[PDB]
Paper text:
The signal recognition particle (SRP) is an efficient protein sorting system that directs the translocation of newly synthesized proteins from translating ribosomes to the endoplasmic reticulum (ER) or plasma membrane. Similarly, the eukaryotic SRP receptor (SR) consists of two proteins, SRα and the membrane-inserted SRβ, while in bacteria, a single protein, FtsY, is responsible for membrane association and interaction with the translocon. In FtsY, the NG domain (comprising of the N-terminal and GTP binding domains) is involved in binding a GTP molecule and forming a heterodimer with the NG domain of Ffh. The N domain of FtsYNG consists of a four-helix bundle (αN1−N4), while the G domain adopts a classical Ras GTPase fold in which five conserved motifs (G1−G5) are arranged around the nucleotide-binding site.
A 100-molar excess of Fragment 1, 2 or 3 was then added to the drops containing FtsYNG crystals. In the Fo-Fc electron density maps of the holo structures containing Fragment 1, 2 or 3, we observed medium to high densities in the IBD in both copies of FtsYNG. Nevertheless, it is clear that Fragments 1, 2 and 3 bound at two different sites within the IBD in both copies of FtsYNG in the asymmetric unit. The first site is wedged between helix 1 and helix A and involves a stacking with the indole ring of Trp343. The second site is located between helix B and helix 2 and involves a stacking with the aromatic ring of Phe365. Interestingly, the Trp343 site is located between the RNA and GTP-binding sites at the FtsY-Ffh heterodimerization interface whereas the Phe365 site is situated in a hydrophobic patch surrounded by charged residues involved in RNA-binding. While interactions with Trp343 via π-stacking with the core ring structure are observed in the crystal structures with all three fragments, specific interactions with FtsYNG that are unique to each fragment are also observed. In Fragment 1, hydrophobic interactions involving the CγH2 group of Gln339 are also observed whereas in Fragment 2, H-bonds and water bridges with Gly311, Lys312 and Leu340 are seen. Fragment 1 displays hydrophobic interactions with Val403 and H-bonding with Lys406, whereas Fragment 2 forms a water bridge with Gln354 and has hydrophobic interactions with the aliphatic groups of the Lys406 sidechain. The determined KD values between FtsYNG and Fragment 1, Fragment 2 and Fragment 3 are ~100 ± 20, ~100 ± 20 and ~480 ± 20 μM, respectively, while that for GMPPNP is 280 ± 80 μM.
Residue numbers in the entry:
A (entry chain B): 195 to 497
B (entry chain A): 195 to 496
Write the structure that this text describes.
């Protein structure tokens, strides 16, 4: 519930949300204050451009409202930062397709594989049938890990030999899922970053091949990024958004990091819906993102 | 988006907003349709006159564009109902007064006392000093409760003996608030249901006595009404508005009632800013009313 969400964000709340209260207590609204607040936002990984927007809007709103007390900045900041997250607060709906195809993109080692498993279990718990495609075809250990997980959870995993063509594996998986009236297909992909131009090509190849079987596929292109990696997450988002058309973002490992500010940078810089946030180890701790619950937990205060 | 507001509005969305979607599915635009729509608005507690206005504008707007599929009324209805709420979209500003005096009026048992406490905590979290006046002077248990609350929250509460003259308590509270550099004074009042002319004269007396200390007081005359009381909320607004001039409204208990559509009747009939809506038990759940947020949650497909 909500109480677990608050507890999971305590390290980010040191600096953001309720963490602002001690910064404002008894201060004057002046440049020294906005400079300290700028610094605190940047340290939290909110990012130069998004921080500049927040500070600018706050400065203007403070003047317009003729505020006297720095404590009164808290509500204006909660509105400003809430608005950033509200603009990307569109939940993923996987209903009504045969299969709904999720193309999972992102670097290796940011919770991409974990997210695939948790989403698969959530959809199954909802009464949907799920299939996986082991599209990261040149990493033999990762394929075998998806297969073993599929074998442990009674979920089919389509896979070919090491070095198979990723687009062919995923083509075969869509074909299989359509014939078995599978509700949701979740397709892994390679996450090696060196060749940006290569990445755009392998992903564009995957998408084109998909569309030979279903012009609507992929129905979702989901990036996974790790919030504890700070601005590396922002740069990955930039890379994959320019590389392929993203329609959804999952941000993992929000719990236990003081770098939870990166969600605001991702929301503001890209405007792509944030579908899920990972706030713990449990299957259900991959939460459908709710901007309002998120903001309330971050800004929760009991004074 | 707006997941928490959608849930607080779940019962209201059965009849309004997204609840229109099933009503229009696959229908043609004709008299039967507008009749079905009028019925659903009335069931949603939008009120006879406000419903007639909506249906009128919708009809003519539908003929002009020669619309045929009832599905196309949805966007027009969202505009019409959004315009109604946008007219009372104006957040309360309490800055710059010494003190800013809020006179809290309404009947007992509609969230008036809860609203006082939530506002007080919000203003103190904003860096303001707050004081309360226990003006509901013949209800000894209500007064003592307010005092105990003030003691728990380190907020002063001005009170006199049971049966004291409410105008005297509030006069003394303004005097104390001015001496103590209080930023916001929130004055409770009686909300007993019998002898409504009696209560109205008491309120006018309170206002006249306040003005002995500050002719701008009360800076806000706030009605509290409970959305679960449906059209009784509208009749309460009319009564209190006629006796003293309301300047703001707080509509409580939107969560869990199917009659949240009464907000449109309140907005349309009086044109008084709705400052706050109560959408849950938390201090933060007394939310500043933002009309576009409310419409989006109501009319959202998802
Ligand atoms: C909870 O962690 C997982 O879901 C998981 C762990 C190890 C391998 C996995 N492969 C897919 C999900 C998964
Ligand atoms: C076996 O055929 C495939 O896996 C395949 C892969 C990529 C494009 C394709 N087009 C037809 C089959 C096919
Ligand atoms: C925050 O809740 C209240 O406003 C409240 C709860 C219980 C008793 C109260 N008395 C005044 C406010 C109040
Ligand atoms: C205790 O209240 C007063 O002293 C009082 C009440 C109503 C009108 C008043 N005018 C001057 C004092 C006063
Ligand atoms: N009172
Ligand atoms: N009293
Ligand atoms: Na959302």
């Amino acid at each position: 519930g909500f109480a677990r969400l608050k507890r999971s964000l305590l390290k980010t709340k040191e600096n953001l949300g309720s963490g602002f209260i001690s910064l404002f207590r008894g201060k004057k609204i002046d440049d020294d204050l906005f400079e300290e607040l700028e610094e605190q936002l940047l340290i939290a990984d909110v990012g130069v451009e998004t921080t500049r927007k927040i500070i600018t809007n706050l400065t203007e709103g403070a003047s317009r409202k003729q505020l006297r007390d720095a404590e009164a900045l808290y509500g204006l900041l909660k509105e400003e930062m809430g608005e950033i997250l509200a603009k990307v607060d569109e939940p993923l709906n996987v209903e009504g397709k045969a299969p709904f195809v999720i193309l999972m993109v992102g670097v290796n080692g940011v919770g991409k594989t974990t997210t695939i498993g948790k989403l698969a279990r959530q959809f199954e718990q909802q009464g949907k049938s799920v299939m996986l495609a082991a599209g990261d075809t040149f990493r033999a250990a990762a394929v075998e890990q998806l297969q073993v997980w599929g074998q442990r959870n009674n979920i089919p995993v389509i896979a070919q030999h090491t070095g198979a063509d990723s687009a062919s594996v995923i083509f075969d998986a869509i074909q299989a899922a359509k014939a078995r009236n599978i509700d949701v297909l979740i397709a892994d992909t390679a996450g090696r970053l060196q060749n940006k131009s290569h990445l755009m090509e392998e992903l564009k190849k995957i998408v084109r091949v998909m569309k030979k079987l279903d012009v609507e596929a992929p129905h979702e292109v989901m990036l996974t990024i790790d919030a504890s990696t700070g601005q590396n997450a922002v740069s990955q988002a930039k890379l994959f958004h320019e590389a392929v058309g993203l329609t959804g973002i999952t941000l993992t490992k929000l719990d236990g990091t003081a770098k939870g500010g990166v969600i605001f940078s991702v929301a503001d810089q890209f405007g792509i819906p944030i579908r899920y946030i990972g706030v713990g180890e449990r299957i259900e701790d991959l939460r459908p993102f709710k901007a309002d619950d998120f903001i309330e937990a971050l800004f929760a205060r009991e004074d």
